[PDB]
Amino acid sequence: HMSFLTEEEQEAIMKVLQRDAALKRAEEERGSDGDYDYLIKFLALGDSGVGKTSVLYQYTDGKFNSKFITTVGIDFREKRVVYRASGPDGATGRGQRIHLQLWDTAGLERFRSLTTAFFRDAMGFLLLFDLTNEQSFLNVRNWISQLQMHAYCENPDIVLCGNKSDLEDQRVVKEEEAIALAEKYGIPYFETSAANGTNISQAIEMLLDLIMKRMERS
Amino acid sequence: HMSFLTEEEQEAIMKVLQRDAALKRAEEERGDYDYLIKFLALGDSGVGKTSVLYQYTDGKFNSKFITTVGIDFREKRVVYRAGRGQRIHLQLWDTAGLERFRSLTTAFFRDAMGFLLLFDLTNEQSFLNVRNWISQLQMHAYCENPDIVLCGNKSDLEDQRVVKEEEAIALAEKYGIPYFETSAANGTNISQAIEMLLDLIMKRMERS
Ligand SMILES: Nc1nc2c(ncn2[C@@H]2O[C@H](COP(=O)(O)OP(=O)(O)NP(=O)(O)O)[C@@H](O)[C@H]2O)c(=O)[nH]1
Ligand SMILES: Nc1nc2c(ncn2[C@@H]2O[C@H](COP(=O)(O)OP(=O)(O)NP(=O)(O)O)[C@@H](O)[C@H]2O)c(=O)[nH]1
Ligand SMILES: *CCC(=O)Nc1nc2ccccc2n1CCc1ccccn1
Ligand SMILES: *CCC(=O)Nc1nc2ccccc2n1CCc1ccccn1
Ligand SMILES: [Mg+2]
Ligand SMILES: [Mg+2]
């Protein structure tokens, strides 16, 4: 009995779409005075409750809320950052102005078709499970399959995150099984904490590097 | 009362999204034809958007009302002329008109390069709603001033007409939008209205 969007839910989603259009129109008018060199977009997905909203919020604002406010379908956050390409000496190259649009999808099945419609906008994916929830780790293969059927290129860039690493007493997912899974699919893996920020920026910067590197292959 | 999204509704929508991803990936791999042109049909539920596209792609019409489950699209390979013919692969998005799908369908406005906007010549409320639909397009399109072709559909139902041609021509004139009176049942002006939209979209990208 998945229920249809209430008009309050629908108002909230239409306002996200309204914000996204303003953003894309500013980018259409030679957007790529605070301006930038590229609008980079990616998308966070994974089961409900794993920490997708908290991870993006920790990354953009350095803050964390204990209270669970499940996401009404779709949202996004933004961050201006400076990206520097890598070479035989680390982050060697010139600093590029990157405007990040960080899509945040609801994890509950009831929003599956709404959220999948935004894969077309994503250049990369941040895939999360919860180190304290074995079911959310087991669903990772399904999520990856969904990404390969629904992304809008063929081998989409993904970074896997096992989140809530600060809850060490409640950990149930074994490190070797997760590392093996990421190894099997060739995707980078980070254990993260939205609560204290551990590996948040590293995981997102790796995804950003992957997308920039792919883009320079053209 | 409380009503629900069925798993069959969501499965059908996911299959459209799967088909759309497969198509864009095929266009990525040197996608044959010369351009993938996308446009989108919208308007109140029941005005005939699904019927109009089906008449255009297949030359057929179904009397029975099967409301669209959120989104679908059809495809057509056509030849466009500004010899002078270019091979165009058309993606024809078909949105559900009912409010319950407003957010799903609005997410696809950005994928469109032009819009086929419909009302029902026999439903005055659907003509009055045209202004609002134009607002949503301006607010959510790719493109501040998006190409729109307006269609007053069901012209074959002349004895149930309630929208006067002059009122409709006047509305379209206030916006600078081409207007066609169409029939999905017998095909009248269908191909003309879509070719007009295509021409607006082709001419616009050639201004580059
Ligand atoms: N201790 C701890 N709690 C976390 C962490 N990440 C999220 N949480 C908590 O777990 C709950 C769910 O997090 P939330 O970010 O909303 O998850 P979500 O992936 O967005 N869920 P949904 O898909 O329903 O929107 C919240 O109470 C949040 O505070 C983390 O790294 N550590
Ligand atoms: N006589 C006549 N009937 C038409 C015409 N166009 C559509 N219809 C009929 O009107 C009904 C609604 O058509 P349909 O294409 O399903 O409309 P829709 O705009 O796609 N509805 P929705 O937004 O709910 O998916 C159907 O019974 C269809 O046969 C037309 O030009 N003439
Ligand atoms: C998954 C397709 C891809 O490789 N890149 C991509 N994804 C996009 C989503 C929306 C708009 C544009 C998109 N691109 C093209 C830009 C790009 C190309 C290579 C690497 C990164 N980004
Ligand atoms: C402003 C004209 C317009 O709508 N362009 C548009 N719409 C797109 C939707 C999806 C992908 C790319 C799109 N573009 C840019 C290409 C284009 C197409 C037709 C006319 C002008 N530009
Ligand atoms: Mg969330
Ligand atoms: Mg329909």
Numbering used by the authors:
A (entry chain A): -37 to -6, 3 to 188
B (entry chain B): -37 to -7, 5 to 55, 63 to 188
Task: Quote the study on this structure.
Covalent ligands are increasingly used to target challenging proteins. fRab27A contains two cysteine residues (C123 and C188) in close proximity to the WF-binding pocket, which are mutated to serine in crystal structures. Sequence alignment of Rab27A and Rab27B against the Rab family demonstrated that these two cysteine residues are unique to Rab27 among other family members, suggesting that cysteine-reactive covalent fragments targeting the WF binding site may offer a means to ligand Rab27 selectively over other Rabs. Compounds A01 and B01 were confirmed as hits against fRab27A-C188 and fRab27A-C123, respectively. Hit fragment A01 preferentially reacted with fRab27A-C188, whereas fragment B01 was found to react with both fRab27A-C123 and fRab27A-C188 with significant rate enhancement over GSH. Residues K11 and D91 were located in close proximity to the methyl ether moiety, suggesting a route to build further polar contacts in analogues of A01. The structure of B01 bound to fRab27A-C123 demonstrated similar hydrophobic interactions with M93 and M185. However, in contrast to the fRab27A-C188-A01 structures, in which the SF4 pocket is largely unperturbed by C188 modification, and the Rab27A-Slp2a complex, C123 modification by B01 caused the side chain of Y122 to adopt an alternate conformation, opening up an enlarged cavity in the pocket. Interestingly, molecular dynamic simulations on Rab27A (PDB: 3 BC1, chain A) suggested that the Y122 sidechain has three main rotamers with the rotamer trapped by the fRab27A-C123-B01 complex as the preferred conformation. The B01 fragment was also positioned with potential fragment growth vectors to form polar interactions with K11 and D91.
